[PDB]
Amino acid sequence: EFSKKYHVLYQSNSYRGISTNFFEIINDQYSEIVNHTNQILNQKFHYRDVVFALKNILLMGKSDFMDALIEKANDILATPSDSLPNYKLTRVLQEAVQLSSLRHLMNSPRNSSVINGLDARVLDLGHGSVGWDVFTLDYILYPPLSLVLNVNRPFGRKEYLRIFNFLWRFKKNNYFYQKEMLKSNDIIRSFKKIRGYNPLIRDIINKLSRISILRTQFQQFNSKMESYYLNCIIEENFKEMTRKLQRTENKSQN
Amino acid sequence: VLLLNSVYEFVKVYCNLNDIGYEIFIKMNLNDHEASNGLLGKFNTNLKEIVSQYKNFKDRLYIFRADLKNDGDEELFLLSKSLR
Amino acid sequence: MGGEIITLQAGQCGNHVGKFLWSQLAKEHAIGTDGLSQLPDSSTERDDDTKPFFRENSRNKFTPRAIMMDSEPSVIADVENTFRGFFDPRNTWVASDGASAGNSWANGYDIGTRNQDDILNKIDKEIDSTDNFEGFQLLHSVAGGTGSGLGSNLLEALCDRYPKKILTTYSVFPARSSEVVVQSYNTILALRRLIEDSDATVVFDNASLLNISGKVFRNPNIDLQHTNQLISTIISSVTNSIRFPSYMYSSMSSIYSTLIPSPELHFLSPSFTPFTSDHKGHSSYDVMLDLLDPSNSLVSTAMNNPTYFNVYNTIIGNVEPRQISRAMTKLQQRIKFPSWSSSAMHVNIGRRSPYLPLQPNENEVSGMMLSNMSTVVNVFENACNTFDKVFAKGAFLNNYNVGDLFQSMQNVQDEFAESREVVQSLMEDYVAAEQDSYLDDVLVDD
Amino acid sequence: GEIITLQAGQCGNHVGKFLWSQLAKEHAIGTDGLSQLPDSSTERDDDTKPFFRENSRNKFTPRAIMMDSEPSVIADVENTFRGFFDPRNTWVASDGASAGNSWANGYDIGTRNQDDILNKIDKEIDSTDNFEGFQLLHSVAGGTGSGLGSNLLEALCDRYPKKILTTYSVFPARSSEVVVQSYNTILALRRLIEDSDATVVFDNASLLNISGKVFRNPNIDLQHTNQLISTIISSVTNSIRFPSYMYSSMSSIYSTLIPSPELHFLSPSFTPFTSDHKGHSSYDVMLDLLDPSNSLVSTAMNNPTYFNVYNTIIGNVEPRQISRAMTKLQQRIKFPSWSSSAMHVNIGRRSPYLPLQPNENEVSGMMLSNMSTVVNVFENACNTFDKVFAKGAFLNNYNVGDLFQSMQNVQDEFAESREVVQSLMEDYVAAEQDSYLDDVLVDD
Numbered sequence A: 001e002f003s004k005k006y007h008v009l010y011q012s013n014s015y016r017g018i019s020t021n022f023f024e025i026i027n028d029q030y031s032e033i034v035n036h037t038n039q040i041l042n043q044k045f046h047y048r049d050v051v052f053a054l055k056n057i058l059l060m061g062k063s064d065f066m067d068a069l070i071e072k073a074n075d076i077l078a079t080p081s082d083s084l085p086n087y088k089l090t091r092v093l094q095e096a097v098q099l100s101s102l103r104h105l106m107n108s109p110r111n112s113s114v115i116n117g118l119d120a121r122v123l124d125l126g127h128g129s130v131g132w133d134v135f136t137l138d139y140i141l142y143p144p145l146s147l148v149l150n151v152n153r154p155f156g157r158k159e160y161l162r163i164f165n166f167l168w169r170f171k172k173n174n175y176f177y178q179k180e181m182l183k184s185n186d187i188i189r190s191f192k193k194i195r196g197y198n199p200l201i202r203d204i205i206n207k208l209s210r211i212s213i214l215r216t217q218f219q220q221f222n223s224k225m226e227s228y229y230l231n232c233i234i235e236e237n238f239k240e241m242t243r244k245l246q247r248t249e250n251k252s253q254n
Numbered sequence B: 001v002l003l004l005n006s007v008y009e010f011v012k013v014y015c016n017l018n019d020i021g022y023e024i025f026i027k028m029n030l031n032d033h034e035a036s037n038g039l040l041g042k043f044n045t046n047l048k049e050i051v052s053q054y055k056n057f058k059d060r061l062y063i064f065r066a067d068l069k070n071d072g073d074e075e076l077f078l079l080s081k082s083l084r
Numbered sequence C: 001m002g003g004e005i006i007t008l009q010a011g012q013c014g015n016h017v018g019k020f021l022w023s024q025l026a027k028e029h030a031i032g033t034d035g036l037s038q039l040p041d042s043s044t045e046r047d048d049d050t051k052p053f054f055r056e057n058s059r060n061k062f063t064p065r066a067i068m069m070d071s072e073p074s075v076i077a078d079v080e081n082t083f084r085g086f087f088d089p090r091n092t093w094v095a096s097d098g099a100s101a102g103n104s105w106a107n108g109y110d111i112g113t114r115n116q117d118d119i120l121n122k123i124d125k126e127i128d129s130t131d132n133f134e135g136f137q138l139l140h141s142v143a144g145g146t147g148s149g150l151g152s153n154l155l156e157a158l159c160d161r162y163p164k165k166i167l168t169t170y171s172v173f174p175a176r177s178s179e180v181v182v183q184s185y186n187t188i189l190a191l192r193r194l195i196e197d198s199d200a201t202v203v204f205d206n207a208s209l210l211n212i213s214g215k216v217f218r219n220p221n222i223d224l225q226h227t228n229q230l231i232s233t234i235i236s237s238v239t240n241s242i243r244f245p246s247y248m249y250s251s252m253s254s255i256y257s258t259l260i261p262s263p264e265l266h267f268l269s270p271s272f273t274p275f276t277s278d279h280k281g282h283s284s285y286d287v288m289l290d291l292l293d294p295s296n297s298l299v300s301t302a303m304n305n306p307t308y309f310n311v312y313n314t315i316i317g318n319v320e321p322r323q324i325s326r327a328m329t330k331l332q333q334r335i336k337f338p339s340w341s342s343s344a345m346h347v348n349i350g351r352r353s354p355y356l357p358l359q360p361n362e363n364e365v366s367g368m369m370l371s372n373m374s375t376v377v378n379v380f381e382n383a384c385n386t387f388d389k390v391f392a393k394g395a396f397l398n399n400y401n402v403g404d405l406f407q408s409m410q411n412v413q414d415e416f417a418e419s420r421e422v423v424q425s426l427m428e429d430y431v432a433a434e435q436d437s438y439l440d441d442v443l444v445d446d
Numbered sequence D: 001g002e003i004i005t006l007q008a009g010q011c012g013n014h015v016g017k018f019l020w021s022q023l024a025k026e027h028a029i030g031t032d033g034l035s036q037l038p039d040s041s042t043e044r045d046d047d048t049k050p051f052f053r054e055n056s057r058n059k060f061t062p063r064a065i066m067m068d069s070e071p072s073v074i075a076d077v078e079n080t081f082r083g084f085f086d087p088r089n090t091w092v093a094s095d096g097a098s099a100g101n102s103w104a105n106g107y108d109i110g111t112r113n114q115d116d117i118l119n120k121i122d123k124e125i126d127s128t129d130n131f132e133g134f135q136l137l138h139s140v141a142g143g144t145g146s147g148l149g150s151n152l153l154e155a156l157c158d159r160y161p162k163k164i165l166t167t168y169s170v171f172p173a174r175s176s177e178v179v180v181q182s183y184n185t186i187l188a189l190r191r192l193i194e195d196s197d198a199t200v201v202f203d204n205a206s207l208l209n210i211s212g213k214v215f216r217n218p219n220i221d222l223q224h225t226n227q228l229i230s231t232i233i234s235s236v237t238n239s240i241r242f243p244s245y246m247y248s249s250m251s252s253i254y255s256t257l258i259p260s261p262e263l264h265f266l267s268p269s270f271t272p273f274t275s276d277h278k279g280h281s282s283y284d285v286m287l288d289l290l291d292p293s294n295s296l297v298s299t300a301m302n303n304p305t306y307f308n309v310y311n312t313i314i315g316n317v318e319p320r321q322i323s324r325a326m327t328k329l330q331q332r333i334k335f336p337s338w339s340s341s342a343m344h345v346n347i348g349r350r351s352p353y354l355p356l357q358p359n360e361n362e363v364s365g366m367m368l369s370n371m372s373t374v375v376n377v378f379e380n381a382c383n384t385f386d387k388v389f390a391k392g393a394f395l396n397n398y399n400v401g402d403l404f405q406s407m408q409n410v411q412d413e414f415a416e417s418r419e420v421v422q423s424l425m426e427d428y429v430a431a432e433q434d435s436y437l438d439d440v441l442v443d444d
C-alpha cells in the first residue's frame, strides 16, 4: 500500500523532473518509512526488549540469572569439556529462567519470543578443560534483527562471547568465594563443643578467623574490579546507547 | 587475568583447609585428644601455602595498581586508589 | 547467590516493625494492603522479583514470607487487620497466656524452649514450600525481654537446625539508662546468643533512632511507632538489590562475603541521607559524604576518632559514577582502615522501583548504608556497665526463674558468667582488630 | 539567598500584611498564592524564590513565620491572603496572654515557646536551600512585639550564627505610655544592640508627619502607613527580586554600610511614590533625598554627620543626572576628616508586571544612611527611662519570667540596658570626631 501511494506521488511529480518537489516527497517518505520501521521493530520484534535482554544476559546486567545458571550447572561446570552432558544445559537454561526475573518474559505474550533466543555454546579450549572454562552462553538472532543488531557473526569479532568470558571469570571467582565462605562458616560455627576440646582448638580457630579475613581480601578484589567495569564502562556506555535508541521515545523536552 | 587466576587458586587452597578443619572436628567428636597432629600439620602446611600465595598476590596486585595509577587518566588513579 | 528470605518477628517490637516493613515493601512492589497486585492486568511485564518476600498465587495475591510470634495476640492481630487479606493467619503464633517484665527475657527463653516444636513446625512448613531458600531476617530488638528471650532460644534452634541458611538479626538497644537494671539482663543473655549463633546483625540505638526520626521528619511528636519506619527503610535499602536486582549483589551471601571480614565481627552500624517513605535532593557526591556523618547514625556511636572497618552503601537513584568516585576518594581520605585490612569501601546500584512516584534523578540524595566498625562496642558497654553491677550485687537474680528453670537449676551464676565471657570477647575482638598487627598470627607465622 | 520574614506582635503582623500585599503586586501573585500571569510566557524575568516557596504547583508560599499572642492579627492577614500563606508557620502564644504591655511578657511567652517557635522557623528553613537570613518586623515597645523580638533574637543569634537577621523596628511617638514603653524599648533594644544585624528605624512620628500629607487624611493611621514601611522594605529588596547586575545580596549591601562591628540603626528616606510617582528627574530625586523632609526618622538635624550613604533609583535613569547630583551632593555632606565620602548609587528595576510600568518615563527612589543623629529616636525614651526606672513601679511590677526572679535582676537589667543604649549613643558621637581615627591610624 505504501509503495502504491508513493508511486503515485512520484508519478505526479514526474513531469517536474526533480524541481525540489521530488525532494519533498522523499522527505515525507523517509519519515514515514523510518517511523514505521521503528514501530515494527519494537512492536513485532521487540527490539529494545531484545537489546536489554542481551545486556542483561550476555553482558550480565542481571545477577540473579547468572547465579541461577551456575548452581544449576555446577556438575557441568566441574565436569571436563571432553565428556559434557551438553543436553543438560537445555534443562539448565530453562531452570535459570524460572529461577530468575526472566521468567516474566517466559510467561508472557510479546516476551516469550525474546527469551527463547538464548542458547549455550561450548568453546574448545583443549583436553582436560572443564565446563567452567568452556561454557560461553550465546544468543541466536535471526533476520530481521540479525540485520540490525551486532551479533556474534561467524566471520565477525565475536564481541559478546569475548566479553562474556571476561565477565565470566569474575563470576566464577565470586561463585567460589561465596561457596567457600559458607563452608568456612559451617566449620567455624562448631565453637560450642570446644568446652571439652579447647587445648587442641584455640589455635585452629584463631587461625581460621584470621583466614576468613584473608579470604575477604580476595572477595573484595573481585567485587571491586568486577563492579568497576560494570558500573563505569558497561553501564555508562549502555546508558548512552539506549539514550540514543530512546530518542524515538521523545524522552526529552529539550 | 593472573590476579583472577590467583583467586581461583586461593579458593582451592582455602577449601583444602576447610576440609582439613572439618575432619579435625569430626575426629574430636570421636576422640577428644586425638585428631592427629598430622592433620594440624597439613592444616598449617596449606596455611603456609595460602600465606605465600597471599603475599605473592599482593605484590602483583600492588604492581597492577601502580601501573594503573602512573599510566595517566583519572579513572585509573581512582581505580588504583580504590584497590588500597 | 540469593534465595527466599523468611522474616521472623519475636515480639511486639518486631511485630510493630512489621507494619512498616510490609507496608513499605508492598508499596515498592505495587502490592496492596490486601496482598493483591496494585497493577492493572493490562500490563504484565515486571522487572522486580517478589518471590523472596511473597508467595504469588493464582489470584495474584502475595503472601509474606514471614512468621510472627508473640505472647500478646493483639500486636499480630493489629497487623493482620491493618493488612487484612495480606497475611496468612497460620503464620501467627502466640505463647501461652501469661506475663513477665524485665525477667521477661527468661520468660521469652522459656516460651521458646517449651514451644520450639510449634514454632519450628511453622518455620519448616514455610521453608518446605520452596527449594531455593537463603536465610532469615530476625527482628530481635534486644531491648525487649520476651522478644529477646524467644529470639535467643529460636536463634539457637535455627542456627543448628538450618546451618546453611544465613541468619541476619535486627536489634535495637534500650533508650533508657535506668531500665537497664533489667534490660542489662536481657542484653547480656540475648547478646551471648547473638554472638554465638547469628551470621549477621545490624545494631540500632533507640535513642538515636528516635532523635533522628524527629529531626528528619521535623516534628516533636517522637515515637517508636514513627521511628520504626526508619527501621523499615534501612531494611528496604539493604534488600534493594534483591527485590530490584541489577548486577552488583542481589544476595545476602554476596554482601556478607564482601562486608564481613570475620564472622566474629558481624555487627553493623547503619546511617542515612534524607528519603521519602510511607528540597535536600543533593548530589550523590554529597550523599556519600553525608552518609558517614555522625549526625546521620542510627546508633549513638560518638564517632570520636571513628574506629574504621569495611564500609558499604547504596545510593538510591540514577546517579553518575564520576561523582561516586570523587566522593569515594574524599571518603577514603576521611575514614581510616587498619593496615591489615583491605580498606574496602563499596557502593551498590540503588535502582528505584518502577512503581514509585516520579522525582528528578539529579535530586536523588536518598540512601541508607552500613559500616563494619568497632564503634558498636560503645553500645555494648552501656549495657555491660549496667549488668556488671546487678549480677555483681545479685539484684533481681532472685527474680528470673520465669519458667525456664534459671533459678530452679541454679543456672543463675553460670548464665551470667558464660554470657559475660562471650560478650567480652566480642568487644575484645573488635578492639584487637583495631591494630595493624592483628593478622600477624597468620601472616608473620614464618 | 533565601529570606524568611518574621512577623512579631500585632505591629509585626500588620506590617507584614502590607509587605506581602506589595510583594503580591510586584510579583504578580494573587492573595491565593497563585501566579496572576498567563503561562503562555513561562519566563518571568524575576525571581520570587527568595521570598516565596514557589511550588511545583501554581503556588507561591511566602517565606514567613507569623507570630503573636493574639491570633486575630494573624488571622486577619491569613484571611486576606487566602491560600497565599502557609498556616503551619503560624505560632500563637496560646498558653496565657501577655500580662500587659511588657517586653518581659513577650519574652516569657516566647521563652516558653522557644522550641516551638524555632521548630516553625526550621520547618521553613527546610524549604530553603541557600538560606541566608531573616527579616524581623516588630514594634520596639510592645510587650508581645519587643518581647517576642527579644526571644527570637536570642534564640536565633546563637542557633544560626552565620545567618543574617536584620531588624525593622517600629517606634511609637513618645507619649505617656513611655513609663512602660521606654523600658520595653530600652531592654529589648539592649538585646538588639548586642545581638541584631543591621537595623532600620521607622519613627511613627515621621510616618505621621508624612502621612498627614500623602495619605487620605484623616486616615493617616500608623497601621495604614505600613505602606510607607512596606515601600522601604520592598525598595531595599528590589535589587534581589528584580535583580540587576550590581547588588544581588544582603552581604553586598552592608559591605558599604556597616563601618565597624557596631550595630547600626539606619535612617531611610523616600520620594516620590505611588500606591493605593511622577518625579521629574533622577537629578532631583537624589538631591531631594538628602533632606529630612523625606525621612522616616525625625532626626531633625540641620547638620548631622553622615557615614555610609547609599541610594537606589528605580526607572529610566539618565547617568548624567546622577553624575550631576553626585557632584553637588559631594560638596554638601558632613562626614569625618578620616573617611573619603563615598556615596553609593544603585539603579534598580520596575517589575515587568507593574501596572504603572507601561507609562513610567519618570523616576523615584530611596536613600539609606548612617546618621550620628539616628539615635534621636531613642532620646525621649531614654530620658524617661532615667527618671522612671531609677526607682518607680515601672521598674519591678511589670516584670515576669527571668526578669523578675529577683528585684536584683530588674534593677541591674534595667540599668545595664540603659548603659548599653548610652554606649550606642556615645559611639555614634565618637564617630563624629576626627579623633575617632586620628588616635588609630597614626598610632604607630
Ligand SMILES: Nc1nc2c(ncn2[C@@H]2O[C@H](COP(=O)(O)OP(=O)(O)O)[C@@H](O)[C@H]2O)c(=O)[nH]1
Residues within 6 Å of the ligand: C011, C012, C013, C014, C016, C017, C071, C100, C101, C104, C141, C143, C144, C145, C146, C147, C148, C172, C173, C174, C175, C206, C224, C225, C227, C228
Ligand atoms: N524500636 C522499637 N522498640 C519497641 C517497639 N515496641 C516495643 N519496643 C521496645 O520494647 C522494649 C521493652 O520490652 P517489650 O519488647 O516491649 O516487651 P516484651 O513483650 O516482653 O518483649 C523497650 O526497650 C522498647 O524499645 C517498637 O515498635 N519499636
Ligand SMILES: Nc1nc2c(ncn2[C@@H]2O[C@H](COP(=O)(O)OP(=O)(O)O)[C@@H](O)[C@H]2O)c(=O)[nH]1
Residues within 6 Å of the ligand: D008, D009, D010, D011, D012, D014, D015, D101, D139, D140, D141, D142, D143, D144, D145, D146, D170, D172, D173, D204, D207, D222, D223, D224, D225, D226
Ligand atoms: N507603624 C505602625 N505602628 C503600629 C502598628 N501596630 C501597632 N503599632 C504600634 O505598636 C506599639 C506597641 O506594639 P504592638 O505590636 O502594637 O502591641 P503588642 O502586640 O501588645 O506588643 C504601639 O505603640 C503602636 O503605636 C503598625 O502596624 N504599624
